[PDB]
Design a protein around this ligand. Sequence first.
Ligand SMILES: NC(=O)c1ccc[n+]([C@@H]2O[C@H](COP(=O)([O-])OP(=O)(O)OC[C@H]3O[C@@H](n4cnc5c(N)ncnc54)[C@H](O)[C@@H]3O)[C@@H](O)[C@H]2O)c1
Ligand SMILES: NC(=O)c1ccc[n+]([C@@H]2O[C@H](COP(=O)([O-])OP(=O)(O)OC[C@H]3O[C@@H](n4cnc5c(N)ncnc54)[C@H](O)[C@@H]3O)[C@@H](O)[C@H]2O)c1
Ligand SMILES: NC(=O)c1ccc[n+]([C@@H]2O[C@H](COP(=O)([O-])OP(=O)(O)OC[C@H]3O[C@@H](n4cnc5c(N)ncnc54)[C@H](O)[C@@H]3O)[C@@H](O)[C@H]2O)c1
Ligand SMILES: NC(=O)c1ccc[n+]([C@@H]2O[C@H](COP(=O)([O-])OP(=O)(O)OC[C@H]3O[C@@H](n4cnc5c(N)ncnc54)[C@H](O)[C@@H]3O)[C@@H](O)[C@H]2O)c1
Ligand SMILES: NCCCCCCCNC(N)N
Ligand SMILES: NCCCCCCCNC(N)N
Ligand SMILES: NCCCCCCCNC(N)N
Ligand SMILES: NCCCCCCCNC(N)N
Lengths: 337, 321, 337, 321
Amino acid sequence: STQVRGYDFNRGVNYRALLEAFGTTGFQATNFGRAVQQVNAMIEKKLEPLSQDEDQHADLTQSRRPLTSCTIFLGYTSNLISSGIRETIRYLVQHNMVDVLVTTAGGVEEDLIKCLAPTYLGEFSLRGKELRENGINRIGNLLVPNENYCKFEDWLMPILDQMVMEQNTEGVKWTPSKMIARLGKEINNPESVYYWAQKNHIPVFSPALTDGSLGDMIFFHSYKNPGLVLDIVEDLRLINTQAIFAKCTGMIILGGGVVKHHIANANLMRNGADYAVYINTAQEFDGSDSGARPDEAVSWGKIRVDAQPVKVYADASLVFPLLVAETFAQKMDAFMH
Amino acid sequence: STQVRGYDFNRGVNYRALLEAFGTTGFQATNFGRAVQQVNAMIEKKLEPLPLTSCTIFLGYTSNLISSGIRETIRYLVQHNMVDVLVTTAGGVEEDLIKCLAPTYLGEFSLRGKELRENGINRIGNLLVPNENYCKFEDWLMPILDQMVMEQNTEGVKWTPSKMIARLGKEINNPESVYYWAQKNHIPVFSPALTDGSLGDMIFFHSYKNPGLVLDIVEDLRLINTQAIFAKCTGMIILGGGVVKHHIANANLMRNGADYAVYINTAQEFDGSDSGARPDEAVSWGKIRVDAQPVKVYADASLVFPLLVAETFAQKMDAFM
Amino acid sequence: STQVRGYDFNRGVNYRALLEAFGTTGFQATNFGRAVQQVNAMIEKKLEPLSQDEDQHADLTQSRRPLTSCTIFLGYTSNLISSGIRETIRYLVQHNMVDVLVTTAGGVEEDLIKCLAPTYLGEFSLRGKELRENGINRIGNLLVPNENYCKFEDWLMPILDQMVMEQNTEGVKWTPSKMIARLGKEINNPESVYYWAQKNHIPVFSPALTDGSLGDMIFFHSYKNPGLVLDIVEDLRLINTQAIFAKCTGMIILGGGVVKHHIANANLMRNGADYAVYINTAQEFDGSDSGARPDEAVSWGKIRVDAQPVKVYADASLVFPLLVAETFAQKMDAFMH
Amino acid sequence: STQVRGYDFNRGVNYRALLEAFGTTGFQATNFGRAVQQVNAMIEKKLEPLPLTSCTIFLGYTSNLISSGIRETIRYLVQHNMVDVLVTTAGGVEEDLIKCLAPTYLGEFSLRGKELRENGINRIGNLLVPNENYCKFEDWLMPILDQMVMEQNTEGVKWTPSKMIARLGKEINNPESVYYWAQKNHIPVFSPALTDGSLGDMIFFHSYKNPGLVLDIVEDLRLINTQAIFAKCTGMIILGGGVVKHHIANANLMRNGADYAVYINTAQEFDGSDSGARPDEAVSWGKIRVDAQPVKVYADASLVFPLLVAETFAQKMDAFM
Ligand SMILES: NC(=O)c1ccc[n+]([C@@H]2O[C@H](COP(=O)([O-])OP(=O)(O)OC[C@H]3O[C@@H](n4cnc5c(N)ncnc54)[C@H](O)[C@@H]3O)[C@@H](O)[C@H]2O)c1
Ligand SMILES: NC(=O)c1ccc[n+]([C@@H]2O[C@H](COP(=O)([O-])OP(=O)(O)OC[C@H]3O[C@@H](n4cnc5c(N)ncnc54)[C@H](O)[C@@H]3O)[C@@H](O)[C@H]2O)c1
Ligand SMILES: NC(=O)c1ccc[n+]([C@@H]2O[C@H](COP(=O)([O-])OP(=O)(O)OC[C@H]3O[C@@H](n4cnc5c(N)ncnc54)[C@H](O)[C@@H]3O)[C@@H](O)[C@H]2O)c1
Ligand SMILES: NC(=O)c1ccc[n+]([C@@H]2O[C@H](COP(=O)([O-])OP(=O)(O)OC[C@H]3O[C@@H](n4cnc5c(N)ncnc54)[C@H](O)[C@@H]3O)[C@@H](O)[C@H]2O)c1
Ligand SMILES: NCCCCCCCNC(N)N
Ligand SMILES: NCCCCCCCNC(N)N
Ligand SMILES: NCCCCCCCNC(N)N
Ligand SMILES: NCCCCCCCNC(N)N
């Protein structure tokens, strides 16, 4: 039984101790402290060596990812890529601290586009009429110039020409994850999440990849050079076997929607994830999947009954960088060792 | 300039009158009244003369709304061809079908997932779904999938979500099914990530006993975008957020914005989510015409929607017949 | 075990059946159906005759309110008076369907002011700069002209002169509830909630009555005619004995904040309310009192352990008129009988 | 024009640097960065030369924040005279005192109130408070109340909330108490409805063994309004909504608006609540000067506040000493 005590600034600004203090501060501050421990538990377990029996089992996948004592699924809604959390995510992927990525259309395309042009800060109140008249798109309190997508078009189109050909002439069978790997190879920029992703053999799943600017481009291009096909069935198999053949699994889910359900549902195939941390703003009263508490996932069997999941009700733009600072970033060496 | 005034229950209770008073009650009560006007404006426009209509209506809803009784409310609109395009996520598709094989029950939000699981019960909000529901679903679905694979290989069928949804509705062949009616009235259903739910599970398993099935999401994009592009007028009625919302609005962007738009979701904007984005943000992208007067009602659709329908579509059932 | 089934509009628009359908529709629709039953349970119990033993006990209060088999507490946040819910509340009070009212400063003053000038509809997006330049105040998507308060000033001031005198010369010991009764007598308008309230001997409590335009007026007036005193201690006793000496008690709480806690806390004095229905938009993650679920109140003893409380997560402007339509308004006769 | 860019953990971990990156991370991360600037602008202004200051800071918080560890964070600011006026509800006052007699524990939100009650434990969010805590509180409080009544009758003391709060802090006489420090540094505390919580319970009971106590809320209004009226500059830092928020802002309206304003609450506007109102609505009433650049962070203060303080007030501890 721990007592509620907040950080005493009479000790001065000791950032490390200040963050540790959140766990005994209460409300969401405490959930954060719990989130930190749960994520570390995943990390600790992942860094465990793979005994013969577990290594054998984990090795039952075609993937080239070095089996780990714990497979970590990282999911985030598109807008989090629009935000600076893109850098926070790029880092983890860069150093192989996570094994599978799941994000919606926006979450993929905007990572690339940021390699051709930046997103600007703005305000939530800016009116859509004047904005449009100036060729500016609004994403929360962020701003994206139309030119950003034009550039995106110039860069993408030829790649799509390559993919359609490779499809018909070399018989490739495209899927979201495969295309995402390809695009990241193509972007060839170290500031790109997906560039790293493919380099480190970390699969990215996005069932509705057509729901975005990337979908726009594919749509248009499909007229001058028809044929492209994106099968979502193969990718389901792919992402499900990732959960099925894992020694342990951790889910780190930022936001809700498809990203959240797709990751957890994959973990149901192995009868529950071992660790789970949620950081979303959704509430449960609307009966949405997004807002469901981690305990609801327990009923379905997406989170083992003996697991100790945590949900932090907050905007990830604020919490995540912090979570990372106290977990993965602290084991920087181990992930390079 | 309208004054604030709520319904005076001294008149006794006239439900039609009470619903009308919302408009001047304020806060979300007002937005509801505004929503009613917009939905009617769509309707009026759709009913204009000179099978395409004077206004193409896109109806979108999150899966959970199909888990709820709103399944009936949506089934009705589809049943009488009051809407043109349906957009819903995987759960929203499969659960309509499952409800024709077994019911979903009421429950509580507080029920613990441990005991629930031990009793073979899944929780969807304050609703409950027995594992046996999905077993039945599998029994029903498996053989249809076999044919689909067959037809794909021997008959050259290039499956996509909408196509599969049409097939399954035809297959469920039950008047209580939204998708049964959808295919009958040639109302297309779009679900990019159809593989995100039990239907995906089934497709997954089945792919090992009979491999091969392919669901293309490219064709469907063209399909849904052309739906918006060649339309005289368009109205968007979006319950919930996520893919359902963005997908429908992004399609209208191809026509340079929708003519009418009504949203009913619980999302807020501060998180910078697309779900919580106000209709005015969509205007900046060009998904909602600058001259349009969109409306968002911050509320649970399980409450608002049946009411919205009662004061709009249900009031014109004769015109739709 | 009831099955989930929504209203089938193929039966046509039968409003009465449509609303009954909410209970089996799920999510908040169901909570509404439950709210309707809980409120009716209060009503049914209130309309029960008072046996000798219960009548004796209930009669142990100085109040002139005809003891009922169930004392109903109605609470609402100020903004709900600004809205049309003012009419919905005025109705219940008008016909004695509730026994105690609890509302914040705004909730009192705006009821009177609406008797001198109306509140207009507006938009949430209207900028505060241009609004102020035109002497318009914003309350949500509602609008209130400065003139509204000027009028309020002219009407009020002399009454305050009367109260200060009556305080010093006739020894009155003013408190919020007493002043609220007085103001309602003074407003003398049947469209006024508080006019009816005092007429029907229904006490209104508002501990922080000074938190509003009424507080502004009192502040100013206190300079030309100093002395006025508002004791909140007497009112505490008053509102607590209302709960203590009740045969049964029902809480109907719209919104949160003081209104919610003050009513429930009073019910703790009798070791729990018998029925309770909440309609607020608050969530619990912030550890606020507003957002606490009714079950938390059970831990303190504000809601009997055997009660079956209900909370509807929604804007009261939408739900309340409906709740009323299916409960109190249905027993219109009984309350006049 | 600033580009969006989040912290690059490749630099390793520099907490001060990481907090700085929030400003350009976006969504609420940005608002936090904006809040930091505003709080500092207040500070800078307050520290200007030529006991009144070049800027009067009003600090407001909902009771529950005193239940949480934020009690320490607030105690600190009050301890070093970094703020001028405190405004908090009844719970926010009594629980600070109770924490000097017994601690509040961590718990869970899901714990059922039935079992909890059977074990003499009260729930405050995911926190827990034992009934014995309040028994101790009663023991401590009763005799002080006796004196207060006495002094009121024999010495003509006209009690009000602020006055009682000063007295009780003096009385708790413990350095860990916010209110102990408040009275020592002559920092007034306002709580119009002080009778809304255990302190009210105690006052209630005690009034039967020793009747008479009167708490006037009129004097306190004048007191708090004059605080804003005669101020060179004013800054509002409001954690939460309800009375705390409105009361502080309404007081600044008497001076025709506050110079700086930073809000940290979880409330949204759609309900038309005063709590959820954006800072721009306060501008229409004249509570926030038209030229001011207010900031609201949509978040739980238990997370944001300690951080905000670390980057503002804590950075100037030398200036405040
Ligand atoms: N970035 C964009 O805004 C954008 C851009 C292009 C396309 N899209 C398309 O929009 C579709 C829907 O977007 P989505 O499903 O990825 O997300 P979303 O915006 O629909 O959000 C889903 C839920 O995640 C939670 N959430 C969102 N932002 C959060 C935050 N900052 N912190 C915590 N929780 C948060 C909320 O509870 C929200 O209801 C995508 O599938 C994509 O195709 C997104
Ligand atoms: N019904 C289910 O829970 C279920 C079942 C099977 C599969 N799925 C899968 O879960 C994925 C994510 O679900 P989703 O994107 O359809 O929705 P969601 O549950 O993620 O909700 C998205 C947003 O819509 C709003 N919303 C949801 N319910 C609402 C309501 N009743 N009233 C008002 N607004 C509401 C909320 O702001 C929410 O954040 C789906 O793509 C699907 O494949 C859902
Ligand atoms: N009407 C006004 O806006 C106004 C006017 C003058 C003075 N005031 C002053 O402001 C102070 C604070 O106001 P308050 O405590 O009465 O309320 P509030 O605005 O602080 O709301 C408190 C909580 O009630 C809930 N709520 C509010 N509106 C709701 C709705 N429509 N439906 C459901 N739940 C709702 C929300 O969860 C909110 O957080 C009052 O004490 C009063 O003195 C109010
Ligand atoms: N701590 C307690 O729970 C408690 C204890 C005893 C008495 N009380 C009584 O309850 C009454 C109502 O409480 P209140 O008006 O102080 O607050 P509240 O709990 O009613 O909250 C009002 C609003 O402030 C915001 N908020 C609350 N907690 C927040 C957080 N951690 N971060 C961000 N924003 C937050 C929310 O939007 C909320 O709707 C008080 O007047 C008091 O007399 C409180
Ligand atoms: N194959 C398992 C799918 C489980 C779906 C669970 C859906 C839960 N939905 C809400 N909580 N809204
Ligand atoms: N093809 C255009 C897609 C535009 C996507 C815009 C997304 C906005 N997202 C927010 N979170 N506001
Ligand atoms: N005299 C009993 C007072 C009980 C106060 C309970 C406060 C609960 N607070 C939150 N849930 N935030
Ligand atoms: N003395 C001026 C008081 C102004 C009160 C305004 C309240 C606004 N309330 C909202 N819910 N917006």
